[PDB]
Amino acid sequence: GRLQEYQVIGRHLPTEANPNPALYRMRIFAPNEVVAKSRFWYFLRGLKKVKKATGEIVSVNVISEKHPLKVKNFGIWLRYDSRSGTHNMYKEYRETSRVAAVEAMYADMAARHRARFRSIHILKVVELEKTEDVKRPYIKQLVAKNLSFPLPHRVPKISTKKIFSAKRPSTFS
Amino acid sequence: PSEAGHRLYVKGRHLSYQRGRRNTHPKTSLIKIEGVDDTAAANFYLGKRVAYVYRAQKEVRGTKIRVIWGKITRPHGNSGVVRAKFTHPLPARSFGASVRIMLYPSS
């Protein structure tokens, strides 16, 4: 959907035997903080022996892109569920923000592998700092020196209500 | 001299009734306005008056042509079609006929 980054911090309920328990923090991509908390409890239930009934939320914040007007390459590590078994991948994307890469990855996996939102875990998102550390060839092609290309055979836009044009259109824009 | 025409109205067509997929309601009609594409442009003709004129057989009070009067109610869809309400529902045989849209309640 339309995502944005959050950070959420949780904690086990303090008790007389263990005052001042530990604090856990995660980064979650979610449309809103209502499902951000739900994903926090979902991921934490797989790492520690804490539930929502016996825990509490300390803080929830929103992380915004530092330089949303600069083009950069990203790399994503993830696991998912197939129709039989589980697998790990590593893909790359090229754009201006961290959030849109997660949006593109969700749509890409949903198209190429028929993987829904229910069965994808995000392991790590990293910004590729250099240019010689780009691996995949569909991103290698976009960083060649002096890139330029034409746009042949592009249909002009015509109002959908104006039927019965009076001359043959052209595709030489 | 002065061969020009005499027109002070906008021409429209009578499309159909208001309906679901299997039920129709003759209470309101749908009219396609000339030259209107979007619903923002269709806002100009809200509240105007429309007329439907047709030919009869007998002469009653010096004429053989009758008229049915109505007015535009609200826009319909995203393509500029509009809804209308008349004193009597249209004869349901005029699906494709033409009506006259005046400009009486101006501005």
């Binding site: 019965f164 044009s165 595709t171 | 021409k11 494709g96 033409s98």
Partner: protein, 203 residues
């Protein structure tokens, strides 16, 4: 949109079903349609697929009597287009029959309908829809391998009407020479201030 008395559509380069949907909507709205050069339409996909589709159509016939009730397989390109349009209209009612009465289809350009302006529907043109590299066929060719007999008659006749149109083009081109030279000579000589007065108004 606009309301004309009748509109003539040139069929060359139009997808069959996409043109038929627009036509079927206009007929029910109240417009009058005339389709010309029905032998130059196009169908998406490779030709053999269309031939197999037609053979599957041809195998259907009433069992107990083939002279009544059975699907009659018309063999002309205009009749194929007519069948396509007829499938998108409630032709079993009086309203549908009246709508169908507003349609005319021909092969080539008959004499009533030449010397006229021929419109084009841009929502069905092939060059704006299909991928370059894909495959398509021609309805005229499809009718040839199903039993249409008058392919060569129209082909020869169209060369005649196109030769007449070449001379009409020559006359139109010459006429432009006098109108352009007259405008250039006249505009300079006379008008002192109507020129810039029109220019400020955009003319």
């Amino acid at each position: 949109s606009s309301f004309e008395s009748v509109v003539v559509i040139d069929g060359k380069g139009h997808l069959l079903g996409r043109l038929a949907s627009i036509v079927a909507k206009q007929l029910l709205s109240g417009q009058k349609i005339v389709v010309v050069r029905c032998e130059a339409l196009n169908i998406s996909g490779e030709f053999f697929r269309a031939k197999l589709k037609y053979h599957a159509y041809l195998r259907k016939m009433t069992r107990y009597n083939p002279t009544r009730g059975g699907p009659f397989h018309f063999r002309a390109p205009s009749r194929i287009f007519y069948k396509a349009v007829r499938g998108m209209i409630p032709h079993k009612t009086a309203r549908g029959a009246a709508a169908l009465e507003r349609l005319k289809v021909f092969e080539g350009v008959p004499p009533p309908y030449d010397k006229k302006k021929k419109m084009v529907v841009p929502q069905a043109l092939r060059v704006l829809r299909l991928q370059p590299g894909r495959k398509y066929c021609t309805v005229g060719r499809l009718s040839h391998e199903v039993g249409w007999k008058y392919q060569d008659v129209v082909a020869r006749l169209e060369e005649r009407r196109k030769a007449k149109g070449a001379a009409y083009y020559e006359r139109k081109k010459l006429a432009a020479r006098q109108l352009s030279e007259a405008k250039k000579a006249a505009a300079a000589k006379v008008d002192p201030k109507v020129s810039e007065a029109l220019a400020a108004y955009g003319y």
